[PDB]
Amino acid sequence: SRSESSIENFLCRSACVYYATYTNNSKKGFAEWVINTRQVAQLRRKLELFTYLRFDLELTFVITSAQQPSTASSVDAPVQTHQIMYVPPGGPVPTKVKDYAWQTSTNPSVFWTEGNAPPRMSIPFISIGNAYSCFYDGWTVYGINTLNNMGTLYMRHVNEAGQGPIKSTVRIYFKPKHVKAWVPRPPRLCQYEKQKNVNFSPIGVTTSRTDII
Amino acid sequence: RSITLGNSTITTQNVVVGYGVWPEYLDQPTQPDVATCRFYTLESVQWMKNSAGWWWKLPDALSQMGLFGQNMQYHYLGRTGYTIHVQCNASKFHQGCLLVVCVPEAEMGCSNLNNTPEFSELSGGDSARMFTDTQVGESNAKKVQTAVWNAGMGVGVGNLTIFPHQWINLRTNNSATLVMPYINSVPMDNMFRHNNLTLMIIPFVPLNYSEGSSPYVPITVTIAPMCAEYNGL
Amino acid sequence: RSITLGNSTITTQNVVVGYGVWPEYLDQPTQPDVATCRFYTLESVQWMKNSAGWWWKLPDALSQMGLFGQNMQYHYLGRTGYTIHVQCNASKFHQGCLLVVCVPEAEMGCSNLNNTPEFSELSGGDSARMFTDTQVGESNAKKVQTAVWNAGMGVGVGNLTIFPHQWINLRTNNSATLVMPYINSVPMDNMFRHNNLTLMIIPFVPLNYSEGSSPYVPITVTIAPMCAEYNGL
Amino acid sequence: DIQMTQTKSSLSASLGDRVTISCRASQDISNYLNWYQQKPDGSVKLLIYYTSTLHSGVPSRFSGSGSGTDYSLTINSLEQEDIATYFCQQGNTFPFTFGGGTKLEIRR
Amino acid sequence: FCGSAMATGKFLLAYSPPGAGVPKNRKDAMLGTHVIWDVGLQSSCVLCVPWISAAGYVTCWYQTNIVVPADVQSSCDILCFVSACNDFSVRMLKDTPFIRQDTFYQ
């Protein structure tokens, strides 16, 4: 009951941070997500108690599928294989599904077929500085700080499909590891409005009552 | 009492220091020592009854402050520590209470939900930008939302005591002192695109007096850089 | 070879020193050392066939020479020593002979017998005022009499070798070096109303060449202050 | 202000085909667009809260696209319940401006 | 400071060395040699200065206002004493111009 309130027992929890779908034959279906913790409100409030963080990263992908309605005549398909490409900060980025930026040798990718354990991969502390800065009072556009940029993830099918359209949905789970935290900070009171900045609309201090006595 | 530093001399008579650490030193960078360390005194602000607060962004106030401020344009990098002396001089007939906080990396919040505030609203050179007791409406394009109970950061203003602070109570206390180290994620930063400290003064209990006394109380801020060093040739 | 001083570096390969003494140090005055000692290089003059001479008044040339020259207005007193490097670069097909003297307290003589020469004729900032092979007539009001065989002092120009000097003979020699102490009657002087040194260059045997060579030879003067110290706060 | 122009204001198609409603702005609004759907009995609800991401609980027959000034909606398999009125609204500047309506109807 | 015991204020005491002009503002008078004189803490502030035969200025500036309680007057005064800190160095005695005479006193 003494160690439940430590830092590693507070932040090393898994959390779903992104959810997207993609079809194979559409020439518009392939996923994309920049790695940041500023999308979901329950993970963002825990990381914003501290100014400087430094943690390893660990991701897990739960990919399913569906059989979208085809025309006719005996749909039978083999197992599907997916590619999950990680783009380090300062790398090439795809614009279509069929592109030369998938095949580059410095963007590490994982391949995985349906029916196995989900594809974990782990990313160390990748930054030029010494800590990720959750709050940055300055310019690079105000309060951006491109020095804590963790990379981008792209997903696509590798199987060419002929008889049936198949859409697939991927959920990404997010887990800090070996967390260090510096310079504590008060917890947020107003609601979050945008992702990039810290803008708000003013709110009362607390819930009110009728009398002081 | 009567300490001196270069060609500047102030006089004092308890000191709260940083996070328990003292400012210490770190291509090959060299240090300026004789040309810099002196008490740069900003001009005084008047604490009236209808006041709300003030704030100074800290490596912006000393941008035009002479032989330290002329070093800003010749140097691209650097790291600095500070020592702040704040004193308000009232009588034993006035009453009030201040909070003197020093916030590392205090991002401010705009009044429009889509933009970000312009540079002339974040900080003036040796002028105190002042809080407000109302909301700034959303028709304003690039202005800082200066609701004082949120301290411009979207937070509870009572919980600002987690930073290093000092309560100036006019019944018992007269001044404040704060020794702040160099707190940043990189050892040397850009000094024109970063304000890594913010000193706020918020009157929690407002000023009050009887008729006949002076209708104001002046607050004097004195900043002294320590451990000033730069990367250069 | 390749000596350096601050952020300036020249290269050389015999040195005549003052009157046998070396420049040494002396309210309470303190010294500048890092901001000052560097080789201030004046621009080059062209030694043609119809040349007569040049002269530089020495604490006037470094009046607008940067971080030494900015110290001139902040300081009322001071004493300085100098080190001069003069080099002309011709071929083994040219011929000539220079005399490089350094005259302490060289009062110049006016062209009118009743007046005294104006300040703009005594010395220009980092520009060589040049002698003449004629008389300046007495109808000129305030001009320096620049008869080169009298050296502007009313004396014999051959007897200028009693001062510290060095003969630059193009047949055998290439450069000159002079180390001059601080020579004055008071230990600290007014530095705006006194030029306590004067460097002259007089071609005794004129330049000559055959057709095809370059019609000029450039002479480069480099001054380095030593023992620079000032009275101040 | 920004005047959003939905130029058609009346679409007509059958069931099962691909329909596109377009919203054209007055300047660059930088991917801050929302697509609403007003049923004829009055109930209004939000469909798409960016250029291209859906609200939770809205089926996957809707999709959006666009960049800069020109934007678009897409319903790939038109159903009976999708006969309603549609609006676009930017969220960039002040005040919030809504587009004109667009009523659908069965063709024959 | 020969004022009331209930009053509080601050002053600057700047000394411009010979060569620098008289400061035309409080801000550039701050960047020179100066002493911030808090009245409520001590009632005497010493500023040592060389004197020899521009030549200097000993200007003094309002830093803050004078804060006073009720039923206390706000118009105060300031006196100024002068002395020689170290030993001087005097040479070539002569006569003073301050005293003269036409006829014998009888």
D95 token code pair: 């005040």
Domains and CATH numbers, chain C: 1-233 (2.60.120.20)
**DSSP 8-state assignment for residue B60:** H
Resolution (A): 3.5
Six-digit token string for D7: 């130029």
Per DSSP, the residues of E66-82 read: -B--TTS----B-----
Residue D39 DSSP one-character state: -
The secondary structure element, H or E, covering residue A174 is strand A166-184
What does DSSP say about strands C175-180 and C16-17: parallel, antiparallel, or unpaired?
parallel
Tell me the C-alpha distance between A181 and A52, whole Å.
6
Q: CB-based contact (8 Å) between B105 and chain D? A: no
Contacts of D24 (CB under 8 A, 6+ apart): D4, D5, D6, D7, D69, D70, D71
Hey, of E28, E39, E67, E68, which one would you mutate to test binding to chain B, going by the most B CBs within 10 A of its CB? E67
Instruction: For chains B and E, count residue pairs whose Cβ atoms are closer than 8 Å.
Output: 72
Q: Indicate the pairing of strand A166-184 with strand A66-67.
A: antiparallel
Nearest CA in chain E to C233: E17
Please state, in angstroms and rounded to a whole number, the distance separating the CA atoms of residues A20 and C23. Answer: 81
Cβ contacts of B13 on chain E, cutoff 8 Å: 41
Both tokens of residue C139? 């109808």
Encoding tokens for residue D78?
Answer: 């038109």
Contact assignment for B109 to A200 by CB distance below 8 Å: yes
Q: Which of C76, C192, C230, C231 to mutate to test the interface with E (most CBs of E within 10 A)?
A: C76
Instruction: Give the separation between CA B173 and CA B205, rounded to whole angstroms.
Output: 14
D4 occurs within a structural domain: no
Buried b / exposed e across A50-60, counting CB within 10 Å, b at 16+?
Answer: bbbbbbebbbb
Query: Taking the mean position of all CA atoms in its chain, how far away is CA D80?
Result: 17
Q: Rounded to an integer, what distance in angstroms lies between the CA atom of residue E71 and that of residue E93?
A: 56
Contacts of D78 (CB under 8 A, 6+ apart): D13, D14, D15, D16, D17, D19, D104
Rg value, chain D, Cα:
13
Q: A28-47 burial by CB neighbour count: b if 16+ within 10 A, else e?
A: ebbbebebebbeeeebbeeb
* One-character DSSP codes across chain C: --EE-SS-EE-----EETTS---------B---TTT-S-EEPPPEEE-TT---EEEEHHHHTSSSHHHHTHHHH-S--EEEEEEEEEE---SS-EEEEEEEEETT----BSSSSS---HHHH-BTTB-EE-BSSPPPTT-SS-B--BTTTTTTTS-GGGGGGSS--EEETTT--EEEEEE----SSSS--SSS----EEEEEEEEEEE--BTB-S-EEEEEEEEEEEEEB---
With beta carbons less than 8 A apart as the criterion, state whether A86 and A123 touch.
yes
Q: Would you state the structure tokens that stand for residue C12, as one six-digit string?
A: 């050389």
Look at chain D and report how many structural domains it folds into: 1
Q: Strand ranges (DSSP E) for E8-106? A: 10-15, 33-38, 60-62
Q: Which residue of E has its CA nearest to B94?
A: E69
Q: What is the spatial distance between Cα E17 and Cα C232, in angstroms, rounded to a whole number?
A: 8
List the one residue out of B29, B60, B55 whose CA is nearest residue B194: B60
B101-111 as b/e: b if 16+ CB within 10 A: bbbbbbbbbbb
Find, among B85, B194, B198, the residue nearest to B131 by Cα.
B198
Which stretch of DSSP H or E encloses residue B71? helix B71-74
Which of B47, B51, B131 lies closest to B87 in space, CA to CA?
B47
Q: Do D93 and B139 touch (CB under 8 A)?
A: no
Contacts with E18 from chain C: Cβ below 8 Å: 76
Instruction: Tell me the DSSP string of A64-111.
Output: --EE----SS-------EEEEEEE-SS----SSSS-TTSS-TTS-EEE
Burial E36-46 (b: 16+ CB within 10 A, else e): bbbbbbeeebe
Check B116 against A141: CB less than 8 A apart: yes
Task: Give bridge partners of residue C45 from the DSSP assignment.
Answer: C219
Cβ-based contacts under 8 A for chains A and B: 101
Could you tell me the residue range of the domain that residue D23 belongs to? 10-105
Partner-chain residue, chosen from E9, E27, E70, that has the shortest CB–CB distance to B210: E70
8 Å CB contact between C62 and C192: no
Residue D26 domain-assigned (yes or no): yes
Q: Which of B156, B157, B145 is nearest to B116 (CA)?
A: B145
Tallying the residues shown for chain B, one arrives at 233
Q: Are strands B8-10 and E33-38 parallel, antiparallel or unpaired?
A: parallel
Which residue type sits at E98? Answer: F
> Which tokens sit at D43?
């109930």
Q: How far is B19 from chain A (nearest CA, A)?
A: 9
By C-alpha distance, which of C169, C167, C170 is closest to C213? Answer: C170
Q: Which residue has the tokens 């808090």?
A: E38
Question: Which of A:41-70 have CB within 8 Å of B?
Answer: 51-52
A88 to each of A56, A148, B22, C149, how far by Cα in Å? 15, 12, 38, 80
Q: How far is CA C126 from the centre of its chain?
A: 10
* Nearest neighbour of E8 by CB, restricted to B39, B43, B91: B91
Length of chain C: 233
Neighbours of chain C (3+ CB pairs under 8 A): E
What count of other Cβ atoms lies within 10 Å of the Cβ of residue C50?
A: 7
How far is B197 from B55, CA to CA, in rounded Å? Answer: 10
**Is D5 within the bounds of a domain?**
no
Please identify which residue in the block is written with the tokens 């260090």: A180
Kindly report the number of other CB atoms within 10 A of residue A4's CB atom: 7
- Closest by CA position to C219, among listed C44, C65, C58: C44
Evaluate whether residue D1 is within a structural domain: no
Count CA within 13 A, CB hemisphere, residue A9.
6
Q: Is A180 helix (H, G, I), strand (E, B) or coil?
A: strand
Exposure letters B64-83 (e unless 16+ CB within 10 A, then b): ebbebbebbeeeebbbbbbb
Residue A160 per-residue DSSP state: -
Peptide bond into D95 cis (omega under 30): yes
Q: How far apart are CA D93 and CA B77, in angstroms?
A: 37
B-contacting residues in E 47-76 (Cβ below 8 Å): 63-71
Q: Positive or negative CA dihedral for A41, A46, A52, A53?
A: negative
Is E40 an interface residue toward C (CB < 8 Å)? Answer: no
Q: Is the distance from CB of C53 to CB of C153 less than 8 angstroms?
A: no
Under DSSP, is residue B54 helix (H, G, I), strand (E, B) or coil? strand
Which residues of chain B neighbour E9 with C-beta distances below 8 Å?
89
CATH at residue D58: 2.60.40.10
Q: How many CA atoms within 13 Å lie on the side-chain side of B103?
A: 26
Distance of CA A206 to the CA centre of its chain: 33
CA distances from C198 to C56, C77, C87, C122, D86 (A): 6, 20, 18, 11, 92
Determine how β-strand A152-157 pairs with β-strand A81-87: antiparallel
- Comparing CA positions, the residue from C36, C120, C138 lying closest to residue C82 is C36
Do the Cβ atoms of E65 and B220 come within 8 Å? no
**Do C209 and C215 contact (CB within 8 A), yes or no?**
yes
Å between D2 CA and nearest CA of chain B: 15
Question: Cβ distance E19 to C74 under 8 Å?
Answer: yes
Tell me whether residue D40 is in a domain.
yes
Determine the straight-line distance between the first and last CA of chain B, rounded to whole angstroms. Answer: 38
Residue B228's H or E segment, with its range, is strand B217-229
On whether the CB atoms of residues D33 and D84 are closer than 8 A, the answer is no
Q: Which of B114, B139, B143 to mutate to test the interface with D (most CBs of D within 10 A)?
A: B114
Q: With contacts defined as CB-CB under 8 Å, which chain E residues touch B214?
A: 65-68
Q: Is E35 on the interface with C (CB under 8 A)?
A: no
Q: Alpha-carbon Rg of chain E, whole angstroms?
A: 20
- How many angstroms separate the CA atoms of C155 and C167, rounded? 20
Q: For residue B186, what are its two tokens?
A: 């990189």
Chain B neighbours among A 180-209 (CB < 8 Å)?
Answer: 183-190, 193-194, 197-203, 205
Residue D2 belongs to some domain of the structure: no
Q: Which of D60-63's residues contact partners 24+ apart within 8 Å by CB, and which partners?
A: D60/A21, D60/A167, D62/D35
Cα–Cα distances (Å) from D104 to B48, D24, D54, D58, E52, in that order, read 63, 19, 21, 19, 98
Q: What is the DSSP code string of B124-191?
A: BTTB-EE-BSSPPPTT-SS-B--BTTTTTTTB-GGGGGGSS--EEETTT--EEEEEE----SSSS--S
Structure-derived torsion over alpha carbons of residues E58, E62, E64, E68, reported in degrees to the nearest 10: 110
Distance, in Å, from the CA atom of E57 to the CA atom of D39, rounded to the nearest integer, reads: 84
Buried b (16+ CB within 10 A) or exposed e, B115-152: bbbeeebbbeebebbebeeeebebebeebbbbbbbbbb
Q: Establish if D75 belongs to a structural domain.
A: yes
Q: Are B164 and B16 in contact (CB under 8 A)?
A: yes
Give the amino acid at A23.
T
- Residue tagged 């100036």 (tokens): B168
Interatomic CA distance for residues A32 and A155, integer angstroms: 7
CB contact under 8 A, C76 and E18: yes
First to last CA, chain A: 36
Check: CB of residue B213 under 8 Å from CB of residue B94. yes
Burial level of C134, CB count in 10 A (0-12/13-18/19+)? exposed
